[PDB]
Design an enzyme around this catalytic site. Structure first.
Site, PDB file in Angstrom:
ATOM      1  N   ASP A  25     122.092  36.661  -3.325  1.00 59.44           N
ATOM      2  CA  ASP A  25     121.523  37.495  -2.020  1.00 59.44           C
ATOM      3  C   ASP A  25     122.983  37.721  -1.584  1.00 59.44           C
ATOM      4  O   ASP A  25     123.221  36.962  -0.580  1.00 59.44           O
ATOM      5  CB  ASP A  25     120.528  36.780  -1.337  1.00 59.44           C
ATOM      6  CG  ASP A  25     120.164  37.492  -0.090  1.00 59.44           C
ATOM      7  OD1 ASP A  25     120.676  38.649  -0.136  1.00 59.44           O
ATOM      8  OD2 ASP A  25     119.099  37.003   0.327  1.00 59.44           O
ATOM      9  N   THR A  26     123.486  38.968  -1.430  1.00 59.96           N
ATOM     10  CA  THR A  26     124.760  39.304  -0.735  1.00 59.96           C
ATOM     11  C   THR A  26     124.319  39.389   0.567  1.00 59.96           C
ATOM     12  O   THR A  26     125.471  39.457   1.406  1.00 59.96           O
ATOM     13  CB  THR A  26     125.289  40.328  -1.263  1.00 59.96           C
ATOM     14  OG1 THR A  26     124.347  41.646  -1.295  1.00 59.96           O
ATOM     15  CG2 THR A  26     125.615  40.335  -2.932  1.00 59.96           C
ATOM     16  N   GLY A  27     123.303  39.679   1.126  1.00 61.33           N
ATOM     17  CA  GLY A  27     122.910  39.765   2.497  1.00 61.33           C
ATOM     18  C   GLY A  27     122.724  38.466   3.300  1.00 61.33           C
ATOM     19  O   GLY A  27     122.862  38.582   4.478  1.00 61.33           O
TER      20      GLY A  27
HETATM   21  C1  LIG Z   1     120.595  33.057   5.555  1.00 65.04           C
HETATM   22  C2  LIG Z   1     119.076  34.059   5.506  1.00 65.04           C
HETATM   23  C3  LIG Z   1     118.421  33.878   4.473  1.00 65.04           C
HETATM   24  C4  LIG Z   1     118.356  33.472   6.619  1.00 65.04           C
HETATM   25  N1  LIG Z   1     119.599  35.275   5.776  1.00 65.04           N
HETATM   26  C5  LIG Z   1     118.508  36.351   5.740  1.00 65.04           C
HETATM   27  O1  LIG Z   1     117.677  36.281   5.722  1.00 65.04           O
HETATM   28  C6  LIG Z   1     119.436  37.652   6.287  1.00 65.04           C
HETATM   29  C7  LIG Z   1     118.934  38.027   7.549  1.00 65.04           C
HETATM   30  N2  LIG Z   1     119.528  39.509   7.943  1.00 65.04           N
HETATM   31  C8  LIG Z   1     119.342  39.528   9.531  1.00 65.04           C
HETATM   32  C9  LIG Z   1     119.689  38.740  10.384  1.00 65.04           C
HETATM   33  C10 LIG Z   1     118.742  38.043  11.391  1.00 65.04           C
HETATM   34  C11 LIG Z   1     119.197  37.378  12.363  1.00 65.04           C
HETATM   35  C12 LIG Z   1     120.435  37.282  12.563  1.00 65.04           C
HETATM   36  N3  LIG Z   1     121.506  38.129  11.722  1.00 65.04           N
HETATM   37  C13 LIG Z   1     121.094  38.869  10.763  1.00 65.04           C
HETATM   38  C14 LIG Z   1     119.213  40.466   7.077  1.00 65.04           C
HETATM   39  C15 LIG Z   1     119.462  40.034   5.664  1.00 65.04           C
HETATM   40  N4  LIG Z   1     118.838  38.608   5.329  1.00 65.04           N
HETATM   41  C16 LIG Z   1     119.106  38.514   3.863  1.00 65.04           C
HETATM   42  C17 LIG Z   1     117.873  39.060   2.891  1.00 65.04           C
HETATM   43  O2  LIG Z   1     118.497  39.315   1.593  1.00 65.04           O
HETATM   44  C18 LIG Z   1     117.132  37.711   2.805  1.00 65.04           C
HETATM   45  C19 LIG Z   1     115.822  37.926   1.614  1.00 65.04           C
HETATM   46  C20 LIG Z   1     115.012  36.860   1.624  1.00 65.04           C
HETATM   47  C21 LIG Z   1     113.789  37.011   0.764  1.00 65.04           C
HETATM   48  C22 LIG Z   1     113.769  37.813  -0.555  1.00 65.04           C
HETATM   49  C23 LIG Z   1     112.640  38.068  -1.128  1.00 65.04           C
HETATM   50  C24 LIG Z   1     111.343  37.359  -0.608  1.00 65.04           C
HETATM   51  C25 LIG Z   1     111.555  37.034   0.713  1.00 65.04           C
HETATM   52  C26 LIG Z   1     112.704  36.710   1.402  1.00 65.04           C
HETATM   53  C27 LIG Z   1     114.914  39.381   2.592  1.00 65.04           C
HETATM   54  O3  LIG Z   1     114.587  39.168   3.781  1.00 65.04           O
HETATM   55  N5  LIG Z   1     114.551  40.153   1.863  1.00 65.04           N
HETATM   56  C28 LIG Z   1     113.379  40.882   2.159  1.00 65.04           C
HETATM   57  C29 LIG Z   1     113.617  42.409   2.828  1.00 65.04           C
HETATM   58  C30 LIG Z   1     114.812  42.715   3.419  1.00 65.04           C
HETATM   59  C31 LIG Z   1     114.812  44.222   3.808  1.00 65.04           C
HETATM   60  C32 LIG Z   1     113.789  45.056   3.433  1.00 65.04           C
HETATM   61  C33 LIG Z   1     112.705  44.645   2.616  1.00 65.04           C
HETATM   62  C34 LIG Z   1     112.566  43.337   2.165  1.00 65.04           C
HETATM   63  C35 LIG Z   1     111.602  42.547   1.584  1.00 65.04           C
HETATM   64  C36 LIG Z   1     112.405  41.241   0.799  1.00 65.04           C
HETATM   65  O4  LIG Z   1     112.954  41.479  -0.069  1.00 65.04           O
END
Ligand SMILES: CC(C)(C)NC(=O)[C@@H]1CN(Cc2cccnc2)CCN1C[C@@H](O)C[C@@H](Cc1ccccc1)C(=O)N[C@H]1c2ccccc2C[C@H]1O
Ligand SMILES: [Cl-]
Ligand SMILES: [Cl-]
EC number: 3.4.23.16
Lengths: 99, 99
Positions: A25-27
């Site tokens: 997860d690059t994000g």
């Molecule tokens: C360290 C931690 C994990 C908490 N980081 C994040 O959640 C960051 C948050 N920022 C934000 C942030 C929040 C607070 C402070 N600074 C930054 C935005 C980007 N995310 C990273 C995402 O890649 C995390 C994934 C996790 C996930 C994947 C699959 C299923 C459930 C959870 C995520 O949230 N992805 C989801 C996702 C994302 C965008 C669009 C659609 C979808 C659906 C789903 O794929």
């Protein structure tokens, strides 16, 4: 390897003697694992996702093997819906995004 | 390019004629942008991450440039904490993870 993005980039990891599936997860700034035991001291942390913040335990200097590649770093443990390998460990295995 | 992960993988995107900062996010299934105006009709969607779900507006077949690379695809709009380019558009621009 080269991993395409047609589907979620899930790999097998080894952590704390356990095998788990996790998302590359690059994000994600941090690595976050579902509830498990880890050795050593920990301290609480709040981390923020798209849907708000969750409380986790922060363990430092944890060894993980990610798709065969060893790394050490901080691992957060808590109620995450999927296991996440974040940038703090992706860097260590040499992962890059290429286009 | 080849983007390392020591820092957040932030790039400039262009959407609706305006430049914005966005995160290249292999852990995101979809692309979601902070509130802005987009043309046409929208459909409802709920997207879930850490912390729970948010409600967003789904716009299809939107013109968007990602780090100079042209794409046309689905863009979600809603109260995301940061602009996120997810796998639907990362695939379009040919992005892979490599280690
Ligand atoms: C360290 C931690 C994990 C908490 N980081 C994040 O959640 C960051 C948050 N920022 C934000 C942030 C929040 C607070 C402070 N600074 C930054 C935005 C980007 N995310 C990273 C995402 O890649 C995390 C994934 C996790 C996930 C994947 C699959 C299923 C459930 C959870 C995520 O949230 N992805 C989801 C996702 C994302 C965008 C669009 C659609 C979808 C659906 C789903 O794929
Ligand atoms: Cl670390
Ligand atoms: Cl490097």
């Amino acid at each position: 390897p080269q991993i395409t993005l047609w589907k979620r980039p899930l790999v097998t990891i080894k952590i704390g003697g356990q095998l788990k599936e996790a998302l590359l997860d690059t994000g994600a700034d941090d690595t976050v694992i579902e509830e498990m035991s880890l050795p050593g001291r920990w301290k609480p942390k709040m981390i923020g996702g798209i849907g708000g913040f969750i409380k986790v335990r922060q363990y430092d200097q944890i060894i993980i093997e990610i798709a065969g590649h060893k790394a050490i770093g901080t691992v957060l443990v808590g109620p995450t819906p999927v296991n996440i390998i974040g940038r703090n460990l992706l860097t260590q295995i040499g992962a890059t995004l290429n286009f």
